[PDB]
Amino acid sequence: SGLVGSHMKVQYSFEREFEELMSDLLSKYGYEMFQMDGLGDQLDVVKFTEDFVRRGIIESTIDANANVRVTNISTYFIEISKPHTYLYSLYRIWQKMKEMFGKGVADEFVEAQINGAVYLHDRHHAALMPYCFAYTLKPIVEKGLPFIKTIKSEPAKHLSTFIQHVIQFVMFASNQSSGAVGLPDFFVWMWYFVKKDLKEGIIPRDKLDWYIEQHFQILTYSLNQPIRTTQSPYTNFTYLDRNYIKAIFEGERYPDGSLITDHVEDIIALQKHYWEWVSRERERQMFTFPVLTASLLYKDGKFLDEDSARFINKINMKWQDTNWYISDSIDAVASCEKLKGRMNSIGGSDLNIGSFKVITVNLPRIALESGGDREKYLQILRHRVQLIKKALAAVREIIKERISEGLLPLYENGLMLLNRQYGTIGVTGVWESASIMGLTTEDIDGLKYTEEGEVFVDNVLDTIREEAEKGYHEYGFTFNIEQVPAEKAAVTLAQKDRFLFGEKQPFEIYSNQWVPLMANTDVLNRIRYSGKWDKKVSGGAILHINLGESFKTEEESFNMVKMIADMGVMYFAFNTKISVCEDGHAFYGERCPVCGKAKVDEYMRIVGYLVPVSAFNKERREIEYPRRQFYDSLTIR
Amino acid sequence: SSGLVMKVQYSFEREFEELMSDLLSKYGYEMFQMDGLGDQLDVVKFTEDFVRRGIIESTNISTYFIEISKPHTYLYSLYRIWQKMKEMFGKGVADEFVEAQINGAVYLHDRHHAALMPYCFAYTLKPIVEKGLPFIKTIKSEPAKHLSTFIQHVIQFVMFASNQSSGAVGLPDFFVWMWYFVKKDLKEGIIPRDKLDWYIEQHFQILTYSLNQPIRTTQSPYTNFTYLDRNYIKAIFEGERYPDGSLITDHVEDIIALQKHYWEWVSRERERQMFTFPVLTASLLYKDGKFLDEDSARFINKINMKWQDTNWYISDSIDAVAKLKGRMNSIGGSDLNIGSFKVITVNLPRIALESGGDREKYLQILRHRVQLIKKALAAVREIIKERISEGLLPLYENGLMLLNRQYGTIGVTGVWESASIMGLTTEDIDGLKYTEEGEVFVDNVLDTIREEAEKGYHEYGFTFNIEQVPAEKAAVTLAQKDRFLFGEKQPFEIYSNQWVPLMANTDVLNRIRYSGKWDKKVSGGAILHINLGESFKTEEESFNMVKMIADMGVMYFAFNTKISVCEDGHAFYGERCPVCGKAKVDEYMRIVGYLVPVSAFNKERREIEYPRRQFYDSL
Ligand code: NA
Ligand SMILES: [Zn+2]
Ligand SMILES: [Zn+2]
């Protein structure tokens, strides 16, 4: 095995049954199928490398923002092995599924993954490490960095060291997981060190706000200055309102013995300070992270912390850079077994909640297979979701093996908690699925579901809920549902379906909101749909409404926020188009009010967080129109 | 076509495939397995072995993603180098290098990276202070205005640079630039002047622990600090200015004081927690029997009394730091703005084995092989130039790494074992030593490589240096390859990385004399350890020994005393921790010149070599 007159090959040690499965699938679907799935010539290390190193001049040729987007060698070492660790992960999942459920089930999953009936997320990591978690910093504050075992670090005594530890933890956790590193209680723990150092005279009183903002700066820029690749780890902050702070931290104490809930007003004030500082800082330099969410308790037409709500509403007026999380209860988070707690891939996941893996069901595929028959549709859907549950159970078993092998110290040190992680049934292409079924229309209010289309979506989501609920008793852990961001999946699934079904599949990309971001429809329709269906996925969705112009008054904005909250929307944001100049100043319009230079790019929420449009398009190009194999003077031989 | 076809097919020219097939026929699968080109490329087997390793014996998942691709990017690099050498020198030369690399006649360092990024550099922080983090293009970072942001930028730069290169990130002028921000923050009332030293030390702590708290893998980036003596500070920074416009040389005493503060802080900190990085070197100008900066020399001598944790760099001139000149050393002490883009080492014991004892044949083989190494270095350099033009190596674009300040390095290892196989080593009343003709032999070997290195500048348009490389793993690997090829003719389990092996018992004067003779031949590309059974009694005794060693011409050396650690990481001497009372469970030792746990030594050094290292009872 490994490297094996002339005609050098590389041989991986697969069970013969798996080789036979893969050979049979290639004959059935064709080389193009495997190529589309990333299991074609992507495993050619020589071709991969020669293509990679040649991309620069191509990007310079076609992209005005190439100079900002330019890839360096650190990306090479991350990308080169992804097709190989995906192939390994697919194989290992097949082995585990065969072990648990028999070869029939294992074979069916591999076929569904390759042909696009399902979408295994973070597939290059899937048999190696878990997806995501929203952490509490309590163990960092109390234990230091115990997951780093080659040196013993003392817990922070001061603000500077606390900030260092948080940055290091973020960087560490981002290499132990595929997804977001959430820090919803950051300001709870930062406040402790601000006060401690103030009391001790470490922070001069007359330099208090300066010291605070210096550390805001150090942490925030660190989370937007990537060491490897051209992208920072995905991080989340949450503005916890007074209800959430009181509920989550009831009875909990700081290292000095004081009750955390005795400090609520100070924690709120520090959060407000950050939100204000961040809004100011964007004009100095635009950045993405941490993704901002505010978590508000809202009930019977009222915010229970109206002071915080009006604050968030006010600060958002500038950039609309904060996502609104609305909940009608703090029961799930009270001083944090069937798992309860919001899980959302964009932001707003509750403290100590995560997902070890998402596998998404291709809903348009099922529409294509059903031929318009809604009963047939639901039968296929239920079977697919049952298959996905088995795959998730297998991945969880593999994760447990990795834990036992000492490979995932975030679990050993109690930062990531497996019994606080869902297995996620993802959905995408809800709209396109209904469209193919003949269940969408256009009337005076724009694009919408037909009356039967709405029932159909109800039935789809309710069917998945039922299977998710059954999964708990079946597999001993909790399943959630998410309408996933699908930055790549929305493209690749559409492409696979077009390969298989031709012109029956008319869409270039599948949607990640109940109505497509770029559908011409009345905003009331969007809100109504999110009000109907957000609750069905327990807040695993986002609604974001593009605004042509910022709100004129805080009052107008706030009335809209309350109306959306009244309708039952659980996570939403307003979208503005933010201009940047070549110097990175954020503003609106074509000319920078700071340096007078022209706009060269835009920041926008496309899947739920603010990114440069040039970054979106470059990534989109890389998967949407894959290059044919070409040769030059060297690579022709 | 290519990729997954089930087999995986890489796109190789047929000629390369035929060569590899021929080499497999000649040497056998065990040769490729030894070289890391056998079943290491089996991603499934590699992965299962990796993850189940903790289960079936007696590292976390981030190490997996680094290790899994190394056999593949080595294979790619070997191929790309073969292509480039074929282009530049013809197929015969390209083929010859590949054979030499696979069979162990030469040793391509950082082989998994060799066609992708360069080896090392000792940076000035001037571009960081003046321009911030310009190599990060996705955000524009303002230059630091305060000490806390300066420290952040240094940490980020180290982490960034460690992913743009294979080897050390040297920071020889760190304290020159740190001083500027210490002064600045004090003036602007950022620091309660009552807490000035606490404040400085807080930043010492944040920087130092960050550089010993690995985010990925079990090991931090390799970093170097240098205590620049007053001569070096004046020479290097003549005419240079801080951002406020003041002359740097107007602050020599302040910079010296800050350096001393760090060295003192470090020495105290090891009691709280033992750490490796940054590797500490002191650079001293020494001429005609005296330190020109005696204050600094006596300081280093004094602070070293506790842990001997600082390496001595000795030079008789500051001309090179005032056709590339300047010291290049893989362990520490590389001069400011000096690096190497790649090292390729010649296996000297292999040549001894091939020569059959014929010294003229030996030197003929040596000169041909060094000439082959120069061609391979030239090819690697052209590939690095390609990567630069492809926008992949931003440290070059941003003037942090400078290609015209990097050597191509001809490495040497196993000088001693090579001489031994030739019959030129003996045992006397004062222990193991080269014979008289053995010394002449080593002169001839080094002079031969020196001649070729010098010729290389006219031949290839860049400068070559020589280093007796640390060879942490190479010293084992090459010995094992030679054993496979030559059997009982090759008696050594590991080759030597010092002029006389650490594990050979000899009078200390012999070690010093050899280093005194030959360090200059490799322009300081070597290290000497003097292993001590116990700490020096007095500072005067220690300082007399240091001056004697400097007098003899030794250019880079350290004393070693075994440092104990308990399970909680406290450093001490003896069997019981004076801090927590727990038992010693491990030892720190220079593996080659930097202090690491003995348990972290690679297996062969841990079991074969380290236990046999000579320690001196008296000097
Ligand atoms: Na993902
Ligand atoms: Zn501007
Ligand atoms: Zn102890």
Coordinates of C-alpha atoms in Angstrom, one line a residue, chain A residues 31-252:
Chain A
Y31 CA -16.7 10.1 -13.7
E32 CA -18.4 13.5 -13.8
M33 CA -20.4 12.6 -10.7
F34 CA -17.3 11.8 -8.6
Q35 CA -15.6 14.9 -10.0
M36 CA -18.5 17.1 -8.9
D37 CA -18.4 15.5 -5.5
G38 CA -14.6 16.3 -5.1
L39 CA -13.5 12.7 -5.5
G40 CA -12.1 13.0 -9.0
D41 CA -8.8 14.6 -10.1
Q42 CA -8.8 16.6 -6.9
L43 CA -6.9 13.8 -5.3
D44 CA -4.1 14.3 -7.9
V45 CA -1.6 16.0 -5.6
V46 CA 0.6 17.1 -8.5
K47 CA -2.2 18.5 -10.6
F48 CA -3.8 20.1 -7.5
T49 CA -0.5 21.8 -6.6
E50 CA 0.3 23.0 -10.1
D51 CA -3.2 24.5 -10.5
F52 CA -3.1 26.1 -7.0
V53 CA 0.2 27.9 -7.6
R54 CA -1.0 29.3 -11.0
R55 CA -4.2 30.9 -9.7
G56 CA -2.7 34.3 -8.8
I57 CA -2.3 35.7 -12.3
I58 CA -5.8 34.4 -13.2
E59 CA -7.3 36.2 -10.3
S60 CA -5.3 39.4 -11.1
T61 CA -6.7 39.1 -14.7
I62 CA -10.4 38.9 -13.7
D63 CA -10.8 40.4 -10.2
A64 CA -10.3 44.1 -9.3
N65 CA -9.9 43.1 -5.6
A66 CA -7.4 40.3 -6.3
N67 CA -4.7 42.3 -4.3
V68 CA -6.9 41.9 -1.2
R69 CA -8.0 38.4 -1.8
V70 CA -4.6 36.9 -2.8
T71 CA -3.9 33.4 -1.3
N72 CA -0.6 32.6 0.3
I73 CA 1.2 29.3 0.8
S74 CA -0.4 28.6 4.2
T75 CA -3.7 27.9 2.4
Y76 CA -1.9 25.2 0.3
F77 CA -1.2 22.9 3.2
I78 CA -4.8 23.2 4.4
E79 CA -6.4 22.6 1.0
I80 CA -4.1 19.9 -0.4
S81 CA -5.3 17.1 1.9
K82 CA -9.1 17.9 2.0
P83 CA -10.1 15.5 -0.9
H84 CA -8.1 12.8 0.9
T85 CA -9.4 13.3 4.4
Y86 CA -12.9 13.5 2.9
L87 CA -12.3 10.2 1.1
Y88 CA -11.0 8.7 4.4
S89 CA -14.0 10.2 6.3
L90 CA -16.5 8.8 3.8
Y91 CA -14.9 5.4 4.1
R92 CA -14.7 5.4 8.0
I93 CA -18.4 6.5 8.1
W94 CA -19.3 3.6 5.8
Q95 CA -17.4 1.2 8.1
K96 CA -19.2 2.5 11.2
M97 CA -22.6 2.4 9.5
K98 CA -22.0 -1.1 8.3
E99 CA -21.0 -2.1 11.8
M100 CA -24.1 -0.5 13.3
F101 CA -26.8 -1.0 10.6
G102 CA -25.5 -3.5 8.0
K103 CA -23.9 -3.1 4.6
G104 CA -27.2 -2.2 2.9
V105 CA -27.6 1.0 5.0
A106 CA -23.9 1.9 4.8
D107 CA -23.9 1.5 0.9
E108 CA -27.1 3.6 0.6
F109 CA -25.6 6.5 2.5
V110 CA -22.4 6.5 0.5
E111 CA -24.5 6.6 -2.7
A112 CA -26.7 9.4 -1.3
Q113 CA -23.7 11.5 -0.3
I114 CA -21.9 11.1 -3.6
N115 CA -25.0 11.6 -5.8
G116 CA -26.3 14.6 -3.8
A117 CA -29.4 13.2 -2.1
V118 CA -27.8 14.3 1.1
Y119 CA -25.0 16.7 2.0
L120 CA -22.4 15.7 4.7
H121 CA -21.1 19.1 6.0
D122 CA -17.5 19.7 6.7
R123 CA -16.9 16.4 4.9
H124 CA -13.1 16.6 4.9
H125 CA -13.3 16.6 8.8
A126 CA -16.3 14.4 9.3
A127 CA -14.5 11.3 10.8
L128 CA -11.9 13.4 12.6
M129 CA -13.4 16.2 14.6
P130 CA -16.8 17.7 15.5
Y131 CA -18.6 20.8 14.1
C132 CA -19.3 23.6 16.6
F133 CA -19.9 24.8 20.1
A134 CA -20.9 28.0 21.9
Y135 CA -18.6 28.0 24.9
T136 CA -18.6 29.5 28.4
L137 CA -15.3 31.0 29.4
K138 CA -15.8 29.8 33.0
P139 CA -13.2 27.0 32.6
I140 CA -10.7 29.3 31.0
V141 CA -11.1 31.8 33.8
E142 CA -10.8 29.1 36.4
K143 CA -8.3 26.6 34.9
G144 CA -6.3 28.7 32.4
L145 CA -5.4 26.7 29.2
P146 CA -5.4 23.1 30.5
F147 CA -6.0 21.6 27.0
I148 CA -2.5 22.8 26.2
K149 CA -0.6 20.0 28.0
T150 CA 3.1 20.8 27.1
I151 CA 3.2 23.7 29.6
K152 CA 1.1 24.4 32.7
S153 CA -0.5 27.8 32.4
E154 CA -1.9 29.6 35.5
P155 CA -5.4 31.1 35.4
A156 CA -5.4 34.8 34.4
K157 CA -5.0 37.3 37.3
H158 CA -5.3 40.4 35.1
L159 CA -7.3 41.7 32.1
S160 CA -4.3 41.5 29.7
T161 CA -3.7 37.9 30.4
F162 CA -7.5 37.1 30.3
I163 CA -7.6 38.6 26.8
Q164 CA -4.5 36.6 25.7
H165 CA -6.1 33.4 27.0
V166 CA -9.3 34.1 25.1
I167 CA -7.5 34.7 21.8
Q168 CA -5.4 31.6 22.3
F169 CA -8.6 29.6 23.2
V170 CA -10.3 30.8 20.1
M171 CA -7.3 29.8 17.9
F172 CA -7.0 26.5 19.6
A173 CA -10.7 25.6 19.4
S174 CA -10.8 26.6 15.7
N175 CA -8.3 23.8 15.1
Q176 CA -10.3 21.3 17.1
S177 CA -13.6 21.9 15.3
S178 CA -15.0 22.7 11.9
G179 CA -17.5 25.4 12.7
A180 CA -18.1 28.5 14.9
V181 CA -16.4 29.3 18.1
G182 CA -19.2 31.0 20.0
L183 CA -18.4 33.2 23.0
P184 CA -21.8 34.3 24.3
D185 CA -20.7 35.1 27.9
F186 CA -17.4 36.9 27.0
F187 CA -18.5 40.2 28.6
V188 CA -19.6 38.4 31.8
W189 CA -16.0 37.3 32.4
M190 CA -14.2 40.3 31.0
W191 CA -16.1 42.5 33.5
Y192 CA -14.5 40.5 36.4
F193 CA -11.0 41.4 35.2
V194 CA -11.8 45.0 34.4
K195 CA -13.1 45.5 38.0
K196 CA -10.3 43.5 39.5
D197 CA -7.6 45.5 37.8
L198 CA -9.4 48.8 38.5
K199 CA -9.6 47.9 42.2
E200 CA -5.9 46.9 42.4
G201 CA -4.7 50.1 40.7
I202 CA -3.4 48.1 37.7
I203 CA -5.8 50.1 35.5
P204 CA -5.4 53.8 36.3
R205 CA -8.9 55.2 37.0
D206 CA -8.3 58.1 34.6
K207 CA -7.3 55.6 31.9
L208 CA -10.2 53.2 32.5
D209 CA -12.1 53.6 29.2
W210 CA -8.8 53.8 27.3
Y211 CA -7.7 50.4 28.8
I212 CA -11.0 48.8 28.1
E213 CA -11.0 50.0 24.4
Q214 CA -7.3 49.0 24.0
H215 CA -8.3 45.5 24.9
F216 CA -11.4 45.7 22.7
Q217 CA -9.0 46.6 19.9
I218 CA -6.4 43.9 20.7
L219 CA -9.1 41.1 20.8
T220 CA -11.2 42.3 17.9
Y221 CA -8.3 42.9 15.5
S222 CA -6.7 39.6 16.5
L223 CA -10.0 37.9 15.5
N224 CA -9.7 39.5 12.1
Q225 CA -6.0 39.0 11.4
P226 CA -5.7 35.5 10.0
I227 CA -2.4 33.7 10.6
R228 CA -3.2 30.9 8.2
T229 CA -5.5 31.2 5.1
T230 CA -7.2 34.5 4.2
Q231 CA -10.0 33.9 6.6
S232 CA -10.2 34.3 10.4
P233 CA -12.0 31.6 12.5
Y234 CA -15.7 32.1 12.6
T235 CA -16.5 33.7 16.0
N236 CA -19.7 34.9 17.7
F237 CA -20.4 37.4 20.4
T238 CA -23.8 37.7 22.1
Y239 CA -25.2 40.8 23.8
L240 CA -27.1 39.0 26.6
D241 CA -30.0 41.1 27.9
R242 CA -30.7 41.3 31.6
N243 CA -33.2 38.4 31.5
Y244 CA -30.6 36.1 30.0
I245 CA -27.8 37.1 32.3
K246 CA -30.0 36.6 35.4
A247 CA -31.3 33.3 34.1
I248 CA -28.1 31.7 32.9
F249 CA -25.9 32.8 35.9
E250 CA -28.3 32.4 38.8
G251 CA -26.3 31.2 41.8
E252 CA -23.0 31.4 39.9

